[PDB]
Design a protein around this ligand. Sequence first.
Ligand SMILES: CCCC(CCC)(c1ccc(OC[C@@H](O)CO)cc1)c1ccc(OC[C@H](O)C(C)(C)C)cc1
Lengths: 247, 11
Amino acid sequence: SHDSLRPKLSEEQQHIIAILLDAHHKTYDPTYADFRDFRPPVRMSPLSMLPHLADLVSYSIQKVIGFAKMIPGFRDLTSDDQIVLLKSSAIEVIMLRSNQSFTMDDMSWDCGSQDYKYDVTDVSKAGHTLELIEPLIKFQVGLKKLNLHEEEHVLLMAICIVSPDRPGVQDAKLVEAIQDRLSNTLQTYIRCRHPPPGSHQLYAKMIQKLADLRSLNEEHSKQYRSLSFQPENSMKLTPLVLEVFGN
Amino acid sequence: NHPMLMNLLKD
Ligand SMILES: CCCC(CCC)(c1ccc(OC[C@@H](O)CO)cc1)c1ccc(OC[C@H](O)C(C)(C)C)cc1
């Protein structure tokens, strides 16, 4: 109450933001140049997009880990806690980071050529049902409409990762200490740098998106468990996806 | 048992 109700950003809070922007810029490629290295998309054989999207998700996990390692304090947690945090958050951070390529026009992910322009049918062709697709699209539209500053977007991803309430977290207080520093930075940023309106209720709306991501995670996990139970599907995944999501 | 994750975390 002090760091949270702070009128203007401290020097420390400014450094936190700068660090997270750098971390995002070194782990998010807006030219999507590496996508050409994945197994090719196959559209139009109902799980035909599973290999390509498994490669996309595996690549995305590597980038999320790269980002997480730069969050102030994250690398100072025990290795087991780092693992737990990343295993639990990876799909949610993927959902958050993907919003940068999401377009409300045709509710697709533009990455950024026609072959790597992904829609609801592509998700369907990875084995997912409307029980996931529908709330996933709702979330993407809801997030896009918040019109976050890049500063808020990177703070939200970091807050998502360093969540002390994940199952299996050992040193919850240490995790909470990092998350609080980040949450305070976000609150102070919105108060002093985000112009009215749209700063109105923005912080609570962002926290609500974190809760929404938990629900999306649960649904994705249930469907993933169903899909990956069949070893001929698991075979089509990548070693990192199996390791991080389980087998 | 998370050698690839652990590798990607190491520096
Ligand atoms: C059509 C795919 C859309 C989506 C939506 C995620 C919100 C996606 C993911 C990463 C992106 O990365 C690039 C982005 O960050 C650039 O802004 C883009 C889009 C996605 C991918 C895979 C999905 O399922 C994978 C299965 O669960 C599997 C294979 C593990 C068994 C479900 C959705």
